[PDB]
């Protein structure tokens, strides 16, 4: 009778099943999962209203959506600390420790392009910028915090740049029509198409790490929630999350099964 909801998609469905798995492994609490409940504003309201007890929320989403505060930095831990202190104060909400992966914008390149030019980080593109054949989503191309940021902070302009309906880009990168695209760092497609995901070595992109969000009065009543959920703190790399999202979205496995496998492989569950 602890209700854990997820926002829409495979990733939050994996996460809430992880929350269920650790809580049930370590306590006598019974967990009901509510996958695909709805979007951020709706799920946050359900938490505030006591309709659900826990959901996974992103650190950068807290600052921009709920606190309406600018992050002084792009350092992941400083952003989390800001989210957590703000939620505690302004919403009487407890935001527990975040997982490792940072689901933010990413640039990814074909493996062939990475191999020829030894590409590991965005800054490595400088000397090969005229070789880039980019296929960007319209949002990334046109938002001041997307391609414009690449131009300003990394000094990179790609003369060969197309805007593409998001789907077609992976076929185009597969076919060689493009060799670079934007995505979010945990998208299953990046694993599916075997792309090299570049390090944002200048921390241009703002951090979005997931962590459990609940009302403080909930933790007060069920203190035993804290230790289980915090077993996920600092766990799950971008690549591990990519692979799990792939298992659900492409291989058709259930979020519960891929969650349980990961936790077992990590020794978090026996």
From Swiss-Prot:
Recorded topology in the membrane: Multi-pass membrane protein
Keywords, ordered alphabetically: Membrane, Stress response, Transmembrane, Transmembrane helix, Transport, Virulence
GO molecular function: amino acid binding; transmembrane transporter activity
Induction: Up-regulated by salt and chill (temperature of 10 degrees Celsius) stresses.
Record GO biological process: glycine betaine transport; SOS response
Signal peptide: none
Region described as Ergothioneine binding domain: 1-270
Disruption-associated phenotype: Deletion in strain LO28 significantly increases sensitivity to physiological concentrations of human bile, in vitro. Accumulation of abnormally high levels of bile salts, such as chenodeoxycholic acid (CDC), in the cytoplasm, when strain LO28 is cultured in the presence of bile. Attenuates systemic infection following oral inoculation of BALB/c strain mice with bacterial strain LO28. No obvious growth defect in strain LO28 in culture when exposed to osmotic or chill stress.
Intracellular or extracellular location(s): Membrane
Primary localization class, coarse: membrane
Assembly, per entry: The complex is probably composed of at least an ATP-binding protein (EgtUA) and a transmembrane protein (EgtUBC).
Its job: Part of an ABC transporter complex EgtU required for the uptake of ergothioneine (EGT), a natural low-molecular weight (LMW) thiol antioxidant. Responsible for the translocation of the substrate across the membrane. Also contains a C-terminal periplasmic solute-binding domain (SBD) which binds to EGT with sub-micromolar affinity. Does not bind glycine betaine, carnitine, choline, proline, or cholate. Plays a role in bile acid tolerance. Dispensable for choline uptake. Probably not involved in betaine, carnitine or choline mediated osmo- or chill tolerance.
UniProt record similarity statement: In the N-terminal section; belongs to the binding-protein-dependent transport system permease family.
Domain description: The transmembrane domain (TMD) and the solute-binding domain (SBD) are fused. SBD binds to ergothioneine.
Stated name of the protein: Probable ergothioneine transporter EgtUBC
Organism (species): Listeria monocytogenes serovar 1/2a (strain ATCC BAA-679 / EGD-e)
From-to range in the entire protein, with total length: 235 to 504 of 504
């Amino acid at each position: 009778e602890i209700t854990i909801a997820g926002k829409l998609g495979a990733e939050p469905e994996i996460l809430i099943n992880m929350y269920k798995l650790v809580i049930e492994d370590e306590t006598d609490l019974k967990v009901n999962v509510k996958p695909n409940m709805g979007k951020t504003s709706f799920v946050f309201n359900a938490l505030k209203s006591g309709d659900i007890d826990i959901y996974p929320e992103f650190t950068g989403t807290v600052l921009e959506t709920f606190l309406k505060e600018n992050a002084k930095t792009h350092d992941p831990e400083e952003v989390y600390t800001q989210a957590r202190d703000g939620l505690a104060k302004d919403f009487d909400m407890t935001y527990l420790k975040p997982m490792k992966y940072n689901n933010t914008y990413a640039l990814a390149v074909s493996p062939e392009f990475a191999k020829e030019n030894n590409l590991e980080k965005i800054s490595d593109l400088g000397p090969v910028s005229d070789q880039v054949k980019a296929g960007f989503t319209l949002e990334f191309k046109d938002r001041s915090d997307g391609y414009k940021g690449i131009q300003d902070k990394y000094g990179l302009t790609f003369s060969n740049l197309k805007t593409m309906e998001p789907k077609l880009r992976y076929n185009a990168i597969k076919s060689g029509d493009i060799n670079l695209l934007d995505a979010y760092s945990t998208d299953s497609e990046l694993a599916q198409y075997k792309l090299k995901v570049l390090e944002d070595d200048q921390q241009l992109f703002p951090p979005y790490q997931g962590a459990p969000l609940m009302l403080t009065k909930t933790l007060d009543k069920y203190p035993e929630l804290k230790k289980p959920l915090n077993k996920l703190a600092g766990k799950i790399t971008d690549d591990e999350m990519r692979k799990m999202n792939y298992e659900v979205n492409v291989n058709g496995k259930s979020a519960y099964t891929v969650a349980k496998d990961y936790l077992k492989d990590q020794g978090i569950i026996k």
